[PDB]
Paper text:
Doublecortin (DCX) is a neuronal microtubule‐associated protein (MAP) indispensable for brain development. It contains two homologous globular doublecortin (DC) domains—NDC and CDC—connected by a 40‐residue unstructured linker (Kim et al, 2003; Cierpicki et al, 2006), followed by a disordered C‐terminal serine/proline‐rich domain. It recognizes a corner between four tubulin dimers via a DC domain, except at the seam (Fourniol et al, 2010). Although coupled, each DC repeat within DCX appears to have a distinct role in MT nucleation and stabilization: CDC is a conformationally plastic module that appears to facilitate MT nucleation and stabilize tubulin–tubulin contacts in the nascent MT lattice, while NDC appears to be favored along the mature lattice, providing MT stabilization.
In these experiments, rapid (30 s) polymerization captured 13‐PF MTs in a transient state that we initially interpreted as GDP.Pi‐tubulin, but which could in fact be GTP‐tubulin (Estévez‐Gallego et al, 2020). Strikingly, the DC domain density in the rapidly polymerized WT‐MT reconstruction most resembles CDC, while the corresponding density in the 1 h MT reconstruction resembles NDC. Several differences in the CDC vs NDC sequences are also visible in the domain densities, in particular the relatively bulky side chains (Leu and Phe residues, dotted lines), which further supports our domain assignment. Using the calculated atomic models, we analyzed the CDC‐MT and NDC‐MT interfaces (defined as residues situated within 4 Å distance from tubulin). Both CDC and NDC interact with all four tubulin subunits at the lattice vertex, but with distinct tubulin residues. The interaction surface area of these domains with MTs is 1047 Å for CDC‐GTP/GDP.Pi‐MT and 1603 Å for NDC‐GDP‐MT. Can the distinct properties of the DC domains shed further light on this idea? The conformation of the MT‐bound CDC in our reconstruction is substantially different from that stabilized in its crystal structure (Burger et al, 2016; Fig 5C, yellow, root‐mean‐square deviation, RMSD = 4.3 Å). We therefore propose that this apparent structural plasticity of CDC, and lack thereof in NDC, could be related to CDC's involvement in MT nucleation. Specifically, this structural plasticity could enable CDC to both interact with curved tubulin assemblies early in MT formation (EV3A and EV4) and be retained on the nascent MT lattice (GTP/GDP.Pi state). CDC mediates this activity as well as the initial stabilization of the nascent GTP/GDP.Pi‐MT lattice. Retention of CDC at the vertex of four tubulin dimers could help stabilize lateral and longitudinal contacts between these dimers.
Author numbering:
A (entry chain C): 178 to 264
B (entry chain B), C (entry chain b): 1 to 429
């Protein structure tokens, strides 16, 4: 029923990839997850507008884009950084 | 040397220390301010085990308190001996547990644990020579069931050589304080046997009848039930902290108490217990203390030692008494109660004699039992577990917080693999 | 001997000295009138470093204050310790900066500088033996960014042998006080590395969390934030001004701190920090001060020392403590934090022990850090720089005051040539 995915922040690399819950009972909109994530992460501006994939290839827009067991990256007003986080 | 860092967790885990630290500080003459008022110089001989000596000749308890809401932490400082704690150690969240093991281990537990493990480490650098950690929590609630076990799996990776013991609160047999307490039991008992060297199981239900059939208290409140929890914990470390003829510590009470490393569920007892209307009619002799311990109504757990055999028995004594006089009593109870002990273990009784009695009495003791009578304590949990789980009942909150069925299936049979060991060692020859 | 002329510039550069000179005069018992009220004769042993002894047994601070408007200078004399300054040293314009680096360096800066450089020279003739100059300004505003750097390029031509250090205010990472602060940063950082021997970078943003997470101040105003700036500056010169066992000065803290002459951006730290509700629970030991300095939340700059290695570490101590006891702690933090220091530098820790503690405490210290973690501090500026400059945004005020594009292009790559040195020395072997 829920999703086991995780998020880091870009270009700085202290982050140990916290794994917040993603479920229908705890979330009802994709934009709601983009704002509930902001208290548990730090950015430059803090606008969590976008999130790129594990390799930063494509953008995300839906809950149904979330295959299990992958890491995403904090984005928005910035670009992808080619981070070797999971190494 | 030999410092012990005290860690608390849960609503039950906090208010025990408000009774526990009142007892320990009164064994050394400490006001709730934090200065010294004792008279004998023996009290400051091993004061550094529960006290980091700060400036101004003050003393602080080496204690860390954990909750997921501040509804209990402010109630500690607004009572007696609430000023003694350092205000930096109260690490707490804001939401609350929800009485959920999944939220106590994955949702809010991942956030608060980094603000605790640095504080343990900040005390660990202050440890001149670390002995081990002790934990006080429950097994039925949300915080003390999960957040305590989330510390232990991270502490044991940081300290494999250091010992670890939990004064947990096993839930009662018949009355039910918590609706989801069979789920909180089995999912935490699976984590206890991984990374704990010993565990002292305390039931709520047995402590009522001790305070009713024996103490004859009309109105037993928590100011007296938790007092017997403090007499147990102080009754173990009383050889580490004072000069006795035959010393003991948590190191000696681990290998000499646990012969097989997964069989480490104990049962405590305390003696003597004089009522206020019955104290002036009792002989204060050393063999009087022995016959009061080994019955059913002095055990601090819902157990029947008549059905089961002991394996290791630790009796920690305080006061001034003859060494030969105690050991004659410890040998005699092995002879007459020969069915009550296991056959293939000689010298199954451990003697610990200290020389400082509890304040207010003249002589006392503390019983530590290890019998196979706790198989009734867990099979009754596993019987309640398989009834609730086969209907998938109360599952849409644990599964809603990131949990699968295979987490239950391994944890279910591991308790069955636990109890099947106890029945195997019960009736061998 | 060894006098130091104190120069201020900017609205930020003035009100720091109103807190700074209050602290220095209270280390020698000086009223805001300007007479003497001390009790010990040690305080007048090196009084001539910040005080020209005038007639009538009075003392004046050897200080020069610079602004482009009198809206701040009259606010200094109408407060405490505003009567102590000589009324001839307040050299100021009438128009104002406009928060423009070009107007702070070419338009109004060319007029006011001749009325300052004679006053420095009039103090320079009064210098019995000049040590060096210290400057207090900012890097984001108009006056302290430009008018300070216009003095330094003219001072260094007059004094090549004399040392020079600026307690500048590096702008915050996330919140923005000034709209044009990336232009004011890069166009001034290009001028700092030309003619400054060392620089102590202070962020606004880190000083909030020091005054909130550690001091637990409910309402931190500038009477407490600038107080930590004064504790840094007094924590450096405390070996030059009092008899200690192992002396230090700005000469020893320059060559032993800067091994490559363009790598001179530091980070300061202060210890201890006792809250008013937490001072009575802390041990006042010497190894307590070490473990409080080397974390992230005691740094006075937005830096992550976990990402980066130190090169030179200066810890200036005050009070009475053993020499072997400190050096055991300084050696131990080199052993356990071996990834946190650079490999090819042995004895990377500088010890400075004085014998006069700060007034109000018993023992204290002052941390000076030099790590490669400031590459995040400048690349974040250069990332903000290339975004604003590629649109030619906010350029029609700098170009309107006599400035070309090639002024930006050399100054842009010189910061990139600065950071590429730090990454080069970060991970070599
Ligand atoms: N002996 C004793 N048990 C208590 C006390 N307060 C709570 N408990 C027990 O704690 C258990 C409930 O756990 P609780 O503290 O509410 O949950 P948690 O805070 O989320 O870990 C039950 O078994 C209660 O009997 C107390 O003061 N004394
Ligand atoms: N710590 C501190 N920073 C200040 C104070 N006043 C101004 N600042 C900083 O000074 C910078 C703005 O510079 P400003 O003085 O207005 O410009 P200038 O006078 O033209 O150099 C910002 O980074 C402010 O945070 C103060 O009292 N304390």
């Amino acid at each position: 029923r829920p999703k086991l995915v995780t998020i880091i922040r870009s270009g700085v690399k202290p982050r140990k990839a916290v794994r917040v819950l993603l479920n229908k009972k705890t979330a009802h909109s994709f934009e709601q997850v983009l704002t509930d994530i902001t208290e548990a992460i730090k950015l430059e501006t803090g606008v969590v507008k976008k999130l790129y994939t594990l390799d930063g290839k494509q953008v995300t827009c839906l809950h149904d884009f979330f295959g299990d067991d992958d890491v995403f990256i904090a984005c928005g007003p910035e670009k992808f950084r080619y981070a070797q986080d999971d190494f | 040397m030999r410092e012990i860092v005290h860690i608390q967790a849960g609503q039950c885990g906090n208010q025990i220390g408000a009774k526990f630290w009142e007892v320990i500080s009164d064994e050394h003459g400490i006001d709730p301010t934090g200065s010294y008022h004792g008279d004998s110089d023996l009290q400051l001989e091993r004061i550094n085990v529960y006290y980091n000596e700060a400036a101004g000749n003050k003393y602080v308890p080496r204690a860390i308190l954990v909750d997921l809401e501040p509804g209990t932490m402010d109630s500690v400082r607004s009572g007696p001996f609430g000023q003694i704690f350092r205000p930096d150690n109260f690490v707490f969240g804001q939401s609350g547990a929800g009485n959920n093991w999944a939220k106590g281990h994955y949702t809010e537990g991942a956030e608060l644990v980094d603000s605790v493990l640095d504080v343990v480490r900040k005390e660990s650098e202050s440890c001149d020579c670390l002995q081990g950690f002790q934990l006080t929590h429950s097994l039925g609630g949300g915080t003390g069931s999960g957040m305590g076990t989330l510390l232990i799996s991270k502490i044991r990776e940081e300290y494999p050589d250091r010992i670890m013991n939990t004064f947990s609160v096993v839930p009662s047999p018949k009355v039910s304080d918590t609706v989801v307490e069979p789920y909180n039991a089995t999912l935490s008992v699976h984590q206890l046997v991984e990374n704990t060297d010993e565990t002292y199981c305390i039931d709520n239900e047995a402590l009522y009848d001790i305070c009713f059939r024996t103490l004859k208290l009309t109105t037993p409140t928590y100011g007296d039930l938790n007092h017997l929890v403090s007499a147990t914990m102080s009754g173990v470390t009383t050889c580490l902290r004072f000069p006795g003829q035959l010393n003991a510590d948590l190191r000696k009470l681990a290998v000499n108490m646990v012969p097989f490393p997964r069989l480490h569920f104990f049962m405590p007892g305390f003696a003597p217990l004089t009522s206020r209307g019955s104290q002036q009619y009792r002989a204060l002799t050393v063999p009087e203390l022995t016959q009061q311990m080994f019955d059913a109504k002095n055990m601090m757990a819902a157990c029947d030692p008549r059905h089961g055999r002991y394996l290791t028995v630790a009796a920690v004594f305080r006061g001034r008494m003859s060494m030969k006089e105690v050991d004659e009593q410890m040998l005699n109870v092995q002879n007459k109660n020969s069915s009550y002990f296991v056959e293939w273990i000689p010298n199954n009784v451990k003697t610990a004699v200290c020389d400082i009695p509890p304040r207010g009495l003249k002589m006392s003791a503390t019983f530590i039992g290890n019998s196979t009578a706790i198989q009734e304590l867990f099979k009754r949990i596993s019987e309640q577990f398989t009834a609730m789980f086969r209907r998938k009942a109360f599952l849409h909150w644990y599964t809603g917080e990131g949990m699968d069925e295979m987490e239950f299936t391994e944890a279910e049979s591991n308790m069955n693999d636990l109890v099947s060991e106890y029945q195997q060692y019960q009736d061998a020859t």
